[PDB]
Amino acid sequence: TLLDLSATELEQVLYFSKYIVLDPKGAILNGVPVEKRQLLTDEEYRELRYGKQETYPLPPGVDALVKDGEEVVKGQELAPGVVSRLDGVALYRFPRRVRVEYVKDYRVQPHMNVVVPEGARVEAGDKIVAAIDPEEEVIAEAEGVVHLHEPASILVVKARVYPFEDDVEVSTGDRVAPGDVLADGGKVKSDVYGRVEVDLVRNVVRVVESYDIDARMGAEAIQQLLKELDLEALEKELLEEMKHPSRARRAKARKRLEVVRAFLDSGNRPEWMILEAVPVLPPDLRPMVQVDGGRFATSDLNDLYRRLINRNNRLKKLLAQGAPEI
Amino acid sequence: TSDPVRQYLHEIGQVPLLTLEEEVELARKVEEGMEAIKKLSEITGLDPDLIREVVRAKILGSARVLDPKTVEEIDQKLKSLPKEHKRYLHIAREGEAARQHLIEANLRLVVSIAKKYTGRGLSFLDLIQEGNQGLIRAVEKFEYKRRFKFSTYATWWIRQAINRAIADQARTIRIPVHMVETINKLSRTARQLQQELGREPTYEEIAEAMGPGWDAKRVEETLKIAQEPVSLETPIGDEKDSFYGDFIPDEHLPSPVDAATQSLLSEELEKALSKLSEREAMVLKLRKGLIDGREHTLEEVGAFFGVTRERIRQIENKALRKLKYHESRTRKLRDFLD
DNA sequence: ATCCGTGAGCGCAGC
DNA sequence: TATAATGGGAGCTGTCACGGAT
């Protein structure tokens, strides 16, 4: 009632089903700009926070109509059977055929990996492909031009390309904004808000549409929100709507105002409705005494309190260590 | 949504399953990044954990709740390294990210593992949290050089974590896992007897079936330790109008009869000291510990009265005897002895 | 209109 | 410490009237 949130919306935030954004950080979803106190589903929060990266599977045996570094659009096909249902940059994934033309075809295997970019000039002795066994490692027989084909799949990421030749000043993971210098001492700058992923292989600083949106979940969001609320102000707004012709408008405004006035007259802060320190009842009032039979008997409160502690310290460790949000 | 199970299922059900090529790439990238952390730690001279966390911190963001200016300050040093040195920083960032992906994706196995560890005193979800916890350590140690698919080496930490948790969070009274294990084999060997004997094992049968150093006494003893407390709120009668704690007394707290008798005893005992001089009584007060609860030795009492222990000891005897005479005319204090 | 949550006698005994 | 192992498991059924929010 105070935050003008529905009970469903509350549940969603507390039980982690939808994010509530506290600062939009220049977020545009479906064209419409994002606002504070806005409920985002998981899929949406991802697009805005991380990006749009879809890999289309290529049936092993067919080559690629697209090449590494190229860009594709919706209505355009990666291979005869596979098309891209989106626009953006497309990257080869697990090319099965490396054919360096020595100014020769080499087979790729699951564990094998490549360390050279497509169209790279090579000489005898350099490193082109690696593997678990160096006895099975591929080397550079002579001067030749690198070429990779037959990728397992194509990741069509909606991102932008920022090639560089000098050292980068951005490490993968960082977020960027239009004009943000990325590398080459000012020469390489950003063209859009996004997330950077320096590709040392292709010496390319990629940026994927993404902002530092603050869309939190749980009581932490509700607690901050409650703390941000100014009781005096909300009273005013509700009073002005208490002057609205509609009967229901004035009714709801009165009820909200009753809660606000309660907090104002009492002096209690709405944030106290969120709990960070839980009390524990004196153990005598919830004991585990020994019966005449010699056995002990405990109150259900004890098993409830312990259940919380088990979950709390589990979370503290997991958080302190750091691990997937999921 | 109402069913948190289905919620985790959909949350991790959007994460695609990694193909051997994808798995090998990611797991490999993870390993490379961790070793890159080593090299970057050495070059920086910083604590390897700190730099691992500043890399991760950036990967996760300030969104995660070492003030953030620190991780920036470090990141400034990390980025003030030359091009070659920043290379390993970049790779380590990529590895921390691949770590996250590999975990997020290799979780459906954790479900398919914990579903058989249920009914052991912990719920599906509690167990899962434990299996995921161990999984992160397993991913941190998994090597693609072995060439065994992640499932193979992962299950070990997934089963160990849940099984350890069941032995750590299922008893109101914390009991060591090794003890739990003994108890488990006690029931295992017992049931074997029960099904073979066609009847019902005893302390002495299982004891011998268990092996050496195993007697009937030990069986019953172990069962006594295994005894679990019961709920005081347990229902009494078919009418749920009564509970266990209702029919359980208080033995600790002063019962009006007990407190009354103590008030009477101390009164009469004093009335007996009124039958002595304050020196005699005081001596007894300190010696017996009535003066201030603490009983004071004869040497201390002789330090108070400035008297040789022998004289203090003898007057204490004289005082006790005088009390005995007065008692031989009263015997009022004997009643309190009861 | 519908759905959710709220109450629905007191003892005694209850092995 | 390593064959590989990747969407769960059990449902409670013969009240009802009222005040409230949706």
From Swiss-Prot, chain A:
It comes from the Bacteria. The RNAP catalytic core consists of 2 alpha, 1 beta, 1 beta' and 1 omega subunit. When a sigma factor is associated with the core the holoenzyme is formed, which can initiate transcription. Belongs to the RNA polymerase beta' chain family. DNA-dependent RNA polymerase catalyzes the transcription of DNA into RNA using the four ribonucleoside triphosphates as substrates. This is DNA-directed RNA polymerase subunit beta'. It comes from Thermus thermophilus (strain ATCC 27634 / DSM 579 / HB8). The chain holds residues 114 to 565 of 1524 of the full protein.
